[PDB]
Amino acid sequence: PNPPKLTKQMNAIIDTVINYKDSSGRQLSEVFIQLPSRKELPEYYELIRKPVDFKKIKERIRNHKYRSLGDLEKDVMLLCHNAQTFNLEGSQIYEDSIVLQSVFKSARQKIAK
């Protein structure tokens, strides 16, 4: 298992990302918590080779799959980059995923550095 404070730092960072609200009170992470299934949106799985959602990221913290904050960052960047790949530039989901990459990076800097 990971050291307790590393798991605590990962949960604090991911909770900051998931709970973040924009100035209109909207929780930007909402659509990213659970991917649509292969039955609901088969086109997503045709285009995205490594799907991931925040439910999977929290599971990977619980199961100690990430060995560092760098490992955690790689999956959060993947989730957002996948959203940017599937969606059109300027769409709400595409733009929300860019904001969440900034929220992750600043939360990591506050909580760990």
CB count in 10 Å sphere of residue 9: 20
CB count in 10 Å sphere of residue 6: 18
Instruction: Give which of Zn ion, a copy of itself, ligand FX5, none residue 10 binds (C-beta under 5 to 8 Å, depending on kind).
Output: none
Instruction: Give which of ligand FX5, Zn ion, a copy of itself, none residue 60 binds (C-beta under 5 to 8 Å, depending on kind).
Output: none
Residue whose token pair is 């909207």: 26
Contacting residues toward a copy of itself, per CB under 8 A: 30, 33-34, 36-37, 39-40, 49, 55-56, 59, 77, 80-81, 84-85, 89, 98, 101-102, 105
Q: Looking at residue 61, what DSSP letter applies?
A: H
Question: Has 74 been labeled as part of a binding site?
Answer: no
51 lines the binding site for Zn ion (CB under 5 A) = no
Cα distance between residue 100 and residue 15, in whole Å: 12
Phi-psi region of 60 (alpha: psi -120 to 50; beta: other; left: phi over 0): alpha
The minimum distance between CB 52 and a copy of itself, in angstroms, equals 12
Binding site for ligand FX5 (CB under 6 A): 31-32, 35-36, 41, 53, 79, 82-83, 86-87, 93
